[PDB]
Ligand binder design. Structure first.
Ligand code: HEM
Ligand code: HEM
Ligand SMILES: [Cl-]
Ligand SMILES: [Cl-]
Ligand code: NA
Ligand code: NA
Lengths: 713, 713
């Protein structure tokens, strides 16, 4: 059936903003997963998981009698899709059960692992999400095998449809670099936002870069991809060596025996894939990656044998039974158990990427320290495993259940506890009045609160106005935040805060984080007043102020807005059209198309643009909250043309006279072009719409102010 | 940006069932368009529309000073997409403003027409939808030009995204027949559900079939397509000749001067397309179809000149200025006015397809009668115009405003007024108890109500259980409805009804239509009791019984379900997989993915399958309302394989013993295969889900029972 995407493959796609509707959600509109999980008997679930580890099913027999390795792999892959660039991927939505991830080649046979878990999921039902269950299972596997984890938080609600993530442009699974859609350029520079070396891999190729078995060059790929997943060298060595303390790879026979991935498989396969024609197709005969490596002498017990082997032997290159490059300790005795035959043993083996931990000079230092001090290895691995499996879960306030680690970690962008009475409605009114009396303008107030709040991204739930990090490095110097204007606003706000706080009785005070948001609320109310309308913008106190020492500056970098259509801002020239970047930002802010449209039209007339740009300011009453953007955008009396100077900037001229009325960007004019967005603009641009526009603007402004407020969830 | 559709172009697509979410809708959740329209001053709107007719805008000057022809075309095109096979297309959702219809070649320059209406739309805002507006404008155009219309109903609510309609498989606009994706085969047999001869046309090619200017062969295409749009010969001739009483075509220069369609045009085009480089690009120089024909001596006034010219001249084949095939009157004087130059006149001209009205022998009879009796023409055109522009609006209860025609037309599938008191709750309880005492089984009761209610389709809002048409020709003989079993159920229910009605006081009586649905309700109640559960199924009385004479048998034939996954029914072998046919049926029933899932799993275990087939009946307690379908479908103890006899039927055998447990079709097993559907099945197949399953089942059962209940809107 030919579709709009076929006829117009470069039109803008808004369907990303209407995924996850109530229509696709089987749970009732009032279902609250945190409520369900809070009443789960977690200890009962873990006891069932523990039993499962050693209860083999004949349709996928357990290696060594124990599913622990398979399940740790499952949970690292659930988490391992995460990219810091955009926060997308990760375990927090249980996306491994949907396309495309369920059918990625690096996810082969994890369909089996998930199926092994159905009985448990079925038993506990809506009280444990798949997303939570996949991670919990990885933890219980670790615990069952003698490893003490750092803890576990529940609270990852299930999702019901695939997320729309850019995973690359290749049309071939696992395509080696340098092709027509190469994700590399320059000197092995991987394109943002990607964090894997090939389409359908978690991080790197286990044979080495593009299959070249050089541990030294493979280490470069490891470092780059894991950094793109928010892990440093210490965490990376700990994770890889920790993981490969357990289980085995699977490569018993030629890969050509392996059939269609789940999404491609026949209906009778019932959601499973990679059915194999090689011997029994499973167990002793399993084929997953095509490698055939078992790392330790006790693949079902925590040990320090991975480093004992890595350092204790010299390695030689060999091939698995499928032809994959891997390494063997030829001088070793046969000390490694077979997964199924008690009478067979094997020599130590390693992947190219394991040997990187020894042959890269930076990693060797860390590996040696972990070798000589295995308690240091165990602590580093437990902490990195927690970080891996929680990095996308958002603020600590989202963490549920009895096993949440009390230690606050710098990566969590922590927010101090509030220990004092909060301001009330009367105090809020008093503060708004003080703010407006200080002389700060509607533009200043709206821009500052937008800048503070609109760092939030729902992909990993980082960012937002809680913490007042706008006043800290690096946010206070981001170009988009107008550093000099911001510093003058914050100085004025801080004085108001100090005065209010000093006059109080009995413990009451307000945070700067709250006051920044409250001040923006006052700006919005004043703008409504300027248009002749009395409105109250809602405001919820309780944000706290983080310190600079509670703020990892490097990790904050990925939250910098280099494109922000809501402030008509583009930091540099990009290949992706600016309207595409606007819809991406909307998606990160959790906005629907109508919310995006109302919010942008209101920000334009409130003076939120960076630099005071007149682009899109289609009003003769700036700093008044009206629907002038839409009314003027849609006026057929104005004709638009791109400028000679800049083809992405447009002049609107009176159609009869030729006189210049306005200027705009692609982000502005897409509202007058795209057939869905123009239908939205038309609603807000109608003569009956002034009240609608105001009310919908206040609601979406408040939504944005509260994106990180999981303390009020 | 590689997508799931790229990797797995044949996996089943559920996104059609979550279109039109509250996420994409700018109106609040409670907005009620009928309430808004009822408050519109319709007379004020029509006065604005009358003024617009002769208010020429320089960016698209009005032909002859009068936009009336352009607007009649616009409204005809809005309506002209409709197909009886599925009810899709038509004017009822205002889809002409979205892709792909906004950019179909046959919709060229209607983007101008729509933009001419923005000031009106803007003025009245949400109280007149675009969908109603496009039709209203057509009516006013007719009225303005001296033609009395039959009436007008409002009530077409706007929509906010493109509908997913199969419009064909061609990859080339306007591709002629016999290509790789031909919509024709055999002896010029057009593939259902299509109702046009080429991709991007409304009905037929105005040059003749595949561009061959034979009026006789063109007539065959006209007759076939118009019948596929619900119009007979009389209606067809009245519509074509009525339409071409007005206005003109546009082909002033070579089509190569015309640029990108709206969806392909630059952003500065602001939603318009087909910009032309030929001279002024507009007005006297306009190019739309490439034909250059003006039909009458008074293109802005109703006349009898179309038939006078058609029969009054002999016709010669010639070419427009763009090279298109058209006809010119032999020997005629220059009697047709020019659209812009008072000093020019033109000879009468005709399209190939106008000449079909004279050279097809059936049409000639009708055209001659209209020629000789122009009052007959005028009345037939008024009636056909009304039918054209209302055929998708549904039951008369939907029709709003002061101009609704009082006359009830056969095409509306009318329902008699209710003129007597309705049964109350006590009477419903009494009747349910009589139904259950009669011996009708749960399977019989549920199957009968399903068959009566599930005829509805929301594409054109035809069908549903109101009218008791299941007891009439042709529904009583549809194979899916199990005519012999149905006849027995209805005999029993008719006796229950006659007994009840005979015992009543005053005028109280129950309709068979209500009793059929109430009887199904009792079957569901019983099924719940059989499973040990106390449930009450809602029921709303008020359906009336239609007569045979109120039920056009030919028009009803398009409602026959040839595929009904909810009854595990497929009439024949089809090219499209049966799961695809299930999702299509779900969409016509207005169901979401979750509702489809729950409804199918419950119907299976209540005995709704055609023929008592055990396919998908995954329970040992048939006729009891449980979630057994889901529990048993997802049991990994069962292995599924296709049968050697029939690859579309599957055996589920105990994995360890080989014993046969179940049989299923693709409709059954897709719930265990497709990653999104299996995620839904899992919810309802969990240990905590029995009550949720029941409650969601009763809700969707009731939704289906009430789909045509616009009297309770
Ligand atoms: C450079 C990074 C990594 C590479 C290239 C990699 C590669 C692989 C490959 C190719 C397999 C075999 C798949 C199969 O054939 O069954 C696998 C197994 C496994 N990996 Fe990794 N790995 C990486 C990091 C990790 C990390 C971070 C963890 C966990 C903390 C992990 C835990 C495991 C486990 C437990 C298995 C064994 C599965 C089983 O017993 O069935 N690996 N790894
Ligand atoms: C066999 C069916 C028909 C064919 C092939 C057909 C074809 C066409 C074409 C090619 C045009 C010229 C478009 C342009 O270049 O501007 C046109 C114009 C128009 N048609 Fe039809 N037509 C059909 C039926 C109808 C019907 C059912 C109606 C209305 C009841 C209608 C009313 C009009 C009007 C009013 C115009 C003039 C537009 C203007 O003045 O700008 N036609 N028709
Ligand atoms: Cl994601
Ligand atoms: Cl449609
Ligand atoms: Na994420
Ligand atoms: Na329709």
């Amino acid at each position: 059936g030919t579709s709009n995407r076929d006829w117009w493959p470069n039109q803008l796609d808004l369907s990303i903003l209407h995924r996850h509707s109530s229509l696709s959600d089987p749970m009732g509109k009032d279902f609250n997963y945190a409520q369900a999980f809070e009443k789960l008997d977690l200890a009962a679930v873990k006891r069932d998981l523990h039993a499962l580890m050693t209860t083999s099913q004949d349709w996928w027999p357990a290696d060594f009698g124990h599913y622990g390795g398979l399940f740790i792999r499952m949970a690292w892959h659930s988490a391992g899709t995460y990219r810091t660039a955009d926060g997308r991927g990760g375990a927090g939505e249980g996306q491994q059960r949907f396309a495309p991830l369920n059918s990625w080649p690096d996810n082969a046979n994890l369909d089996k692992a998930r199926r092994l878990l159905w009985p448990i999921k079925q038993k506990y039902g809506r009280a444990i999400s798949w997303a939570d269950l996949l991670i919990l299972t990885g933890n219980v596997a670790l615990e069952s095998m003698g490893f003490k984890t750092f803890g576990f938080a529940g609270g990852r609600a299930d999702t019901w449809e695939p997320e729309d993530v850019y995973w690359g442009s290749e049309k071939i699974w696992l395509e080696l670099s340098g092709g027509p859609n190469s994700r590399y350029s320059g000197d092995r520079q991987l394109e943002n936002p990607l964090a894997a070396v090939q389409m359908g891999l978690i991080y790197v190729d286990p044979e080495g870069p593009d299959g070249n078995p050089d541990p030294v060059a493979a280490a470069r790929d490891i470092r780059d991809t894991f950094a793109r997943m928010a892990m440093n060298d210490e965490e990376t060595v700990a994770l890889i060596a920790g993981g490969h303390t357990f289980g085995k790879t699977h490569g018993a026979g030629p890969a050509s025996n392996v059939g269609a991935e789940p999404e491609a498989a026949g209906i009778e396969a019932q959601g499973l894939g990679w059915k194999s024609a090689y011997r029994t197709g499973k167990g002793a005969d399993a084929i997953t990656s095509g490698l055939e490596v078992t790392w330790t002498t006790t693949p079902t017990q925590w040990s320090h044998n991975f480093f004992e082997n890595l350092f204790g032997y010299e390695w030689e290159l060999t091939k698995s039974p499928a032809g994959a490059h891997q390494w063997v300790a030829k001088g070793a005795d046969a000390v490694i158990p077979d997964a199924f035959d008690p009478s067979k043993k094997h020599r130590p083996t390693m992947l190219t990427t394991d040997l990187s931990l020894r042959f890269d000079p930076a990693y060797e230092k860390i590996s040696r320290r972990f070798h000589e001090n295995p308690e240091q290895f165990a602590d580093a691995f437990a902490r990195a495993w927690f970080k891996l499996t929680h990095r996308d879960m958002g603020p600590r306030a989202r963490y549920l259940g009895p096993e949440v680690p009390a230690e606050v970690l710098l990566w969590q962008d922590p927010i101090p506890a509030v220990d004092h009475p909060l301001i009330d409605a009367a105090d809020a009114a008093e503060l708004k009045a003080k703010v407006l009396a200080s002389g700060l303008t509607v533009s200043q107030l709206v821009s500052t609160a937008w800048a503070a709040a609109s760092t939030f991204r729902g992909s990993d739930k980082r960012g937002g106005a809680n913490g007042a990090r706008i006043r800290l490095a690096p946010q206070k110097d981001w170009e988009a935040n107008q550093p000099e204007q911001l510093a003058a606003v914050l100085e004025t706000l801080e004085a108001i805060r100090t005065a209010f706080n000093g006059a109080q009785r009995g413990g009451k005070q307000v945070s700067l984080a709250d006051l920044i948001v409250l001040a923006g609320c006052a700006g919005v109310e004043q703008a409504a007043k300027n248009a002749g309308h009395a409105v109250t913008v809602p405001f919820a106190p309780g944000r706290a102020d983080a310190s600079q020492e509670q703020t990892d500056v490097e990790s904050m970098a990925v939250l910098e807005p280099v494109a922000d259509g809501f402030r008509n801002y583009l930091k540099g020239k990009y290949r992706v059209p600016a309207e595409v970047l606007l819809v991406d930002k909307a998606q990160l802010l959790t906005l629907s198309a109508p919310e995006m449209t109302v919010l942008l039209g209101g920000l334009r007339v409130l003076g939120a643009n960076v630099g005071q740009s007149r682009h899109g300011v289609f009003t003769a009453r700036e700093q008044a909250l009206t629907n002038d953007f839409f009314v003027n955008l849609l006026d057929m009396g104005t004709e638009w043309k791109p400028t000679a100077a800049d083809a992405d900037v447009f002049e609107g001229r009176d159609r009869a006279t030729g006189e210049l009325k306005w200027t705009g960007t692609r982000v502005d004019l897409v509202f007058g072009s795209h057939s869905q967005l123009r239908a939205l603009a038309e609603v807000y641009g109608s003569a009956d719409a002034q009240e609608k526009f105001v009310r919908d603007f206040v609601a979406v402004w408040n939504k944005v102010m509260n994106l990180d407020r999981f303390d009020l969830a």
